Amino acid sequence: SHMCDAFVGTWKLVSSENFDDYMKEVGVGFATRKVAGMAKPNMIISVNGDVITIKSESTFKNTEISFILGQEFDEVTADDRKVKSTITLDGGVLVHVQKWDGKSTTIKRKREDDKLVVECVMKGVTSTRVYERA
Numbered sequence: 001s002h003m004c005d006a007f008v009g010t011w012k013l014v015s016s017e018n019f020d021d022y023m024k025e026v027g028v029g030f031a032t033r034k035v036a037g038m039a040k041p042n043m044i045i046s047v048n049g050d051v052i053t054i055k056s057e058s059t060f061k062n063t064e065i066s067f068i069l070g071q072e073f074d075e076v077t078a079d080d081r082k083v084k085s086t087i088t089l090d091g092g093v094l095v096h097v098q099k100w101d102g103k104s105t106t107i108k109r110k111r112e113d114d115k116l117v118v119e120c121v122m123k124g125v126t127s128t129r130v131y132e133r134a
């Protein structure tokens, strides 16, 4: 049903801003921040029926999530948090909320021009990560 069509594909990270500070706010430790911050992941997004799959492949970690919009799931993040996640579409933006230990962070993924822009927010700290088609 052409849900998420403009997101589907293989995307490569081309810029990052404020990611170390976002990771600090989330609680990521020093060594993981350094290695994770170096990574240039590819994000691979696909849809099969109602199921969306987002894979992230990098030299740091490979991650994979599959989900149905609005339906909570378990996620182990790249930094090894065990979180409860819900992903919805809000006005054409994929909004990914992660909950763990009474904390919450939100990752928004949006298409803007030929890029896919990822905004990661923890309390007052935002990181913006820009991906281009691979």
Ligand SMILES: O=C1C(O)=C(O)CN1Cc1ccc(Cl)cc1
Binding pocket: 023, 028, 036, 043, 056, 077, 078, 079, 107, 118, 120, 129
């Ligand atoms: O899901 C994404 C995505 O498509 C990014 O660019 C950043 N991110 C969150 C994130 C948090 C912590 C670590 Cl260690 C690694 C990634």
